[PDB]
Amino acid sequence: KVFGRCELAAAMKRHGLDNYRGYSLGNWVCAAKFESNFNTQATNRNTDGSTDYGILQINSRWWCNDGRTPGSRNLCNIPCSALLSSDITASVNCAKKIVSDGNGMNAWVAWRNRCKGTDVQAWIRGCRL
Ligand SMILES: [Br-]
Ligand SMILES: [Br-]
Ligand SMILES: [Br-]
Ligand SMILES: [Br-]
Ligand SMILES: [Br-]
Ligand SMILES: [Br-]
Ligand SMILES: [Br-]
Ligand SMILES: [Br-]
Ligand SMILES: [Br-]
Ligand SMILES: [Br-]
Ligand SMILES: [Br-]
Ligand SMILES: [Br-]
Ligand SMILES: [Br-]
Ligand SMILES: [Br-]
Ligand code: NA
Ligand SMILES: [Pt+2]
């Protein structure tokens, strides 16, 4: 599923991401924009053999099981495929674990390089929230 901007903002809010670990909704929407362009089915293979999955490009080295990332863990206790669903529940639940891991949203390299410190409220501007 390719979400609209305000559609995804509303779904992220429903699932409790607005201000989660202190990160306003606009941060999460911005992260999703640059990670997946709002596409739940996005995947990206990394050089280390791991793969990133879904709207927030969550990685198989620590967070999900894809059966092909040697030495990896599955801390969200899910198949990585769950992260590609039109229903963002698994991605949101797992993101909450990631952002609590100590480095905050810096865990998303695209958030750090493209969202951090910017006017992130622009990402939710106009939306019925
Ligand atoms: Br779609
Ligand atoms: Br957009
Ligand atoms: Br929109
Ligand atoms: Br919704
Ligand atoms: Br919910
Ligand atoms: Br915001
Ligand atoms: Br594996
Ligand atoms: Br293994
Ligand atoms: Br594990
Ligand atoms: Br599994
Ligand atoms: Br949803
Ligand atoms: Br959720
Ligand atoms: Br879940
Ligand atoms: Br933080
Ligand atoms: Na894994
Ligand atoms: Pt939820």
Curated annotation (Swiss-Prot):
EC number(s) from the headed UniProt entry: 3.2.1.17
EC top class named in words: hydrolase
This protein's record includes keyword Disulfide bond: yes
Example of a GO cellular component annotation carried by this entry: cytoplasm
Catalytic activity: Hydrolysis of (1->4)-beta-linkages between N-acetylmuramic acid and N-acetyl-D-glucosamine residues in a peptidoglycan and between N-acetyl-D-glucosamine residues in chitodextrins
Domain of life: Eukaryota
Gene Ontology biological process terms in this record: cell wall macromolecule catabolic process; defense response to bacterium; defense response to Gram-negative bacterium; defense response to Gram-positive bacterium; killing of cells of another organism
Entry's family note: Belongs to the glycosyl hydrolase 22 family.
Name listed for the protein in its UniProt record: Lysozyme C
Organism: Gallus gallus
Phylogenetic placement of the source organism: Eukaryota, Metazoa, Chordata, Craniata, Vertebrata
Gene: LYZ
